[PDB]
Design a protein around this ligand. Structure first.
Ligand SMILES: Nc1ncnc2c1ncn2[C@@H]1O[C@H](COP(=O)(O)OP(=O)(O)O)[C@@H](O)[C@H]1O
Ligand SMILES: Nc1ncnc2c1ncn2[C@@H]1O[C@H](COP(=O)(O)OP(=O)(O)O)[C@@H](O)[C@H]1O
Ligand SMILES: [Zn+2]
Ligand SMILES: [Zn+2]
Lengths: 294, 294
């Protein structure tokens, strides 16, 4: 079976064709514009191929409750045209094959869970740190989907007492995303994050904030592997700060090697690199195919 | 089938006999002392009855990984004799019937999930606020058990800027438990919490801290019902503060009635009152019985 994947982002769309084992056969990308024109490009790209199912990993928040009238829509976004657009249903109507749906970060979690750092485990957490901060979690082999999908980027961690930055988040100001996203780093220090790579205090601070968030996730969810991706995490030096800070914050409370001596194999970059998300959309496609047949 | 339950606490043990539908037939309690003598009382109480299975809901942290060599032990505690005592195995050796094991707060979650405020849902979160703070979560109808059971009481929420109290927690100082447990309230204000019922600012502050914790849990786990029990939550006025503060902290980020207009039916006291835990131990017993037969 050939499967289609759509990783829908605020800035670009990535579409791919691939197989259930996560092999990417072909891909394309294009800028995100209004939904009708953007989706028409998707349909035109897939028109070349004979696909059995598609999966969509979308920027959110989204309505990921399959029982909901608004399932398969983006529920909050400043991007023009996208909130409440019938994203999933338009792709189902055009393509006439099964279509899976999830957040983009859920897709990345599935990619690492099946083919990456969590292969063989029954739990993991994938976090991206880029334009925003978001996370997807697998619990007992299934994506975590409660009242909502998680919005773990918006938790309120403690400000560093020397950090004077007010925060980037339009909703909360200095939530984790507001303090530690790519744009927050840029707004705080006055240059883009990639151009601050030689300024240690930038990454100390970023590592401190990420470590505070991870301690909360460890105490609440206790995932068996934590995978950190996104633009900001291309600054690999951040990991060393995280590994120093997490044990200080937890202060020996939970006696596991993952959280102390072997933390460097617990909190890791994605095995699939920057492709975890798009590969995960193929998993969503395969799931949707199997569910239709059942 | 008659089932036995053991709710093991730091101060007292509660033992009960009951049925799979959560009916309590009989109960006894006694102070927690050293483990051999305490467990001998358990065995002597159950000796009267013909039981098919037992469930243990223990104060933790515990090792709740069934594949672990140290499964069914308490892994951290200042109480003399308890850390690493073979609690589960001693009860299995003496009783010679199936024995279930979990944290005490996991038991309370099961009680409310089957017989209480979450009956009919597939997700919930039970939090106790007493001598410590702890929580158990049900996800897709099963207790959440990752690398560890959750230790949600120890997350680091933001101090109120006018609160000068250093915090009660021996590990973290001013983690949620350190700021908002019963003993923290007493140490901060100089009287026991029950004797401060007429001092509004005590409960404003407590509501503010609990609300901050709940916002984090909502963003990370997104449970479909939040149940708040424990000694401190006998001060029912705390709920009204929580209902005012949660929406301010979230600032309309997640559009669900549970988090706004209908928050008073989302964050609730236990339907089972102070018996959620002991009833939950009967559910652990029934589970252990069924698992043996399978
Ligand atoms: N190599 C890098 N090092 C540090 N920051 C980066 C790097 N690449 C991108 N960024 C920053 O990360 C953010 C973009 O995140 P990214 O994961 O690339 O995309 P998006 O989150 O929009 O899908 C921007 O703030 C950008 O400046
Ligand atoms: N009715 C009450 N109102 C406020 N605080 C209470 C009340 N009862 C007990 N407390 C406080 O809660 C803590 C005890 O918690 P509780 O849930 O009764 O027991 P435990 O956590 O030890 O099982 C103590 O700090 C106690 O002073
Ligand atoms: Zn935010
Ligand atoms: Zn603590």
């Amino acid at each position: 079976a050939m499967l289609g994947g759509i990783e829908a982002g605020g800035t670009k769309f990535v579409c791919a064709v691939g197989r259930e084992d996560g092999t990417i056969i072909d891909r394309i990308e294009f800028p995100t514009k209004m939904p009708d024109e953007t989706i028409e490009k998707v349909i035109q790209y897939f028109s070349q191929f004979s696909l059995q199912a598609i999966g969509i990993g979308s920027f959110g928040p989204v309505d990921n409750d399959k029982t909901s009238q608004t399932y398969g829509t983006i529920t909050a976004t400043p991007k023009a045209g996208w909130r409440h657009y019938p994203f999933l249903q338009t792709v189902k109507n055009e393509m006439k094959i099964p279509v899976g749906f999830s957040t983009d970060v859920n897709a990345a979690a599935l990619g690492e869970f099946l083919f990456g750092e969590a292969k063989g485990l029954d739990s993991c957490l994938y976090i991206t740190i880029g334009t925003g901060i978001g996370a997807g979690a697998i619990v007992e082999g299934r994506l975590l989907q409660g009242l909502s999908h998680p919005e773990m980027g918006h938790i309120y961690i403690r400000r560093h007492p020397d950090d004077v930055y007010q925060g980037k988040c339009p909703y909360h100001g200095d939530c984790f995303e507001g303090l530690a996203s790519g744009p927050a780093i840029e707004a705080r220090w006055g240059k883009k994050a990639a151009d601050l790579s030689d300024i240690a205090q930038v990454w100390e601070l970023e590592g401190y904030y990420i470590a505070q968030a991870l301690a909360q996730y460890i105490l609440i969810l206790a995932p068996k592997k934590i995978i950190l991706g996104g633009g900001v995490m291309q600054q690999k030096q951040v990991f060393s700060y995280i590994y120093q800070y997490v044990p200080k914050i937890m202060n020996s409370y939970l006696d596991f090697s993952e959280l102390s001596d072997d933390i460097s194999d617990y909190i890791v970059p994605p095995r699939l690199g920057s492709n975890a998300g798009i590969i995960g959309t193929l998993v969503l496609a395969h799931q949707a195919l199997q569910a239709e047949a059942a």
